[PDB]
Design an enzyme around this catalytic site. Sequence first.
Site, mmCIF file in Angstrom:
data_model
loop_
_atom_site.group_PDB
_atom_site.id
_atom_site.type_symbol
_atom_site.label_atom_id
_atom_site.label_comp_id
_atom_site.label_asym_id
_atom_site.label_seq_id
_atom_site.Cartn_x
_atom_site.Cartn_y
_atom_site.Cartn_z
ATOM 1 N N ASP A 1 0.790 -1.220 0.000
ATOM 2 C CA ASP A 1 0.000 0.000 0.000
ATOM 3 C C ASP A 1 0.828 1.279 0.000
ATOM 4 O O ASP A 1 0.551 2.179 0.743
ATOM 5 C CB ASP A 1 -0.994 -0.046 1.176
ATOM 6 C CG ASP A 1 -2.148 0.974 1.052
ATOM 7 O OD1 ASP A 1 -2.345 1.643 -0.006
ATOM 8 O OD2 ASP A 1 -2.863 1.139 2.063
ATOM 9 N N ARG B 1 0.014 9.177 1.197
ATOM 10 C CA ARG B 1 -0.728 9.164 2.465
ATOM 11 C C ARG B 1 -0.175 8.190 3.523
ATOM 12 O O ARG B 1 -0.552 8.285 4.699
ATOM 13 C CB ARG B 1 -2.211 8.810 2.248
ATOM 14 C CG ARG B 1 -2.451 7.420 1.686
ATOM 15 C CD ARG B 1 -3.943 7.131 1.439
ATOM 16 N NE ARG B 1 -4.019 5.802 0.837
ATOM 17 C CZ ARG B 1 -3.930 5.556 -0.473
ATOM 18 N NH1 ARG B 1 -3.955 6.515 -1.365
ATOM 19 N NH2 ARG B 1 -3.812 4.340 -0.908
ATOM 20 N N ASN B 2 0.681 7.264 3.090
ATOM 21 C CA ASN B 2 1.186 6.191 3.937
ATOM 22 C C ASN B 2 2.647 6.336 4.249
ATOM 23 O O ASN B 2 3.271 5.451 4.765
ATOM 24 C CB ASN B 2 0.914 4.858 3.288
ATOM 25 C CG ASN B 2 -0.540 4.446 3.432
ATOM 26 O OD1 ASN B 2 -1.200 4.882 4.412
ATOM 27 N ND2 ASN B 2 -1.070 3.668 2.459
ATOM 28 N N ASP C 1 2.634 2.857 7.607
ATOM 29 C CA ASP C 1 1.556 1.939 7.250
ATOM 30 C C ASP C 1 1.996 0.497 6.904
ATOM 31 O O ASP C 1 1.552 -0.093 5.928
ATOM 32 C CB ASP C 1 0.738 2.517 6.106
ATOM 33 C CG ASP C 1 -0.477 1.693 5.787
ATOM 34 O OD1 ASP C 1 -0.703 1.475 4.560
ATOM 35 O OD2 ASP C 1 -1.164 1.250 6.743
#
Length: 288
Positions: A148, A152-153, A166
């Site tokens: 992923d 954003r991670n 993450d």
Amino acid sequence: HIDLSALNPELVQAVQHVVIGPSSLIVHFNEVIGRGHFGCVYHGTLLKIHCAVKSLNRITDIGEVSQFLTEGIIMKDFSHPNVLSLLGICLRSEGSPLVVLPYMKHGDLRNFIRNETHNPTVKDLIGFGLQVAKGMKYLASKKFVHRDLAARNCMLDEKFTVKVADFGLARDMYDKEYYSVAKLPVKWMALESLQTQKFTTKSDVWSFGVLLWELMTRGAPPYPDVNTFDITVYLLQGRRLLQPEYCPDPLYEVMLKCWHPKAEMRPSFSELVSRISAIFSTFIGEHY
Ligand SMILES: CN1CCN(c2cnc3cc(C(F)(F)F)cc(-c4cccc(O)c4)c3n2)CC1
């Protein structure tokens, strides 16, 4: 209420160096940093180290807790300046187990680059990309597949060091709006992952390419007008994200390489660090 008396005493011995004594950690339950599906994150202080503390609310069983401990020991030895570190774990006789993580002053990298209070330069942006590439080179070396990767991670600390996040005990769905349902981050996924739902280091490379496009656009959404059910066909036609306005030509060439439809023809993270290092080095920063 997890039965700590039931833990195997030999496992408890082996995990000790990940373990943080309740007496060494104050969680500020007042001060919520954020939340995922698996738990809330709070400000904490660790004996004084400002930290982020995540309460893993879907650990209930003693079996689950014992797995959690073993996972903690394993993840504690990951160590690289561009990968988020596990400070430790804390077990409580009441409440869910806690994951203790460093505080990241500037939050997630997507939010930072979208923030109107900061003005990173093109070099800073390329530099963020390079840092992710270095952190991913590390994970790939350990045969660890992220699955992923997205802006954003990744997190940003007070020194503007990027940390790939993450994963491991910090893995979660933190913003559901970018996942389609088994929740899939479809606009970041490699063509073959869309077809097979399997992920590899070569699919992390593809995602990394999209991340680099997020960086160079200062957080534009990728493929917002291509539907989830149309994206596989769009990609099969050879269509890709367009060159960002402020993205150097060689850096868009790097992104297109990451989106090669043949996984085996994509660059390794080692080659990405090489290539991005060079492009980064052509920019003059404030002090070097
Ligand atoms: C106002 N901002 C002040 C900094 N903020 C920070 C600082 N450190 C974080 C550390 C972690 C970590 F993974 F390490 F646990 C996680 C988060 C975080 C957690 C959930 C959602 C989210 O969006 C961010 C952190 N969020 C966000 C809000």
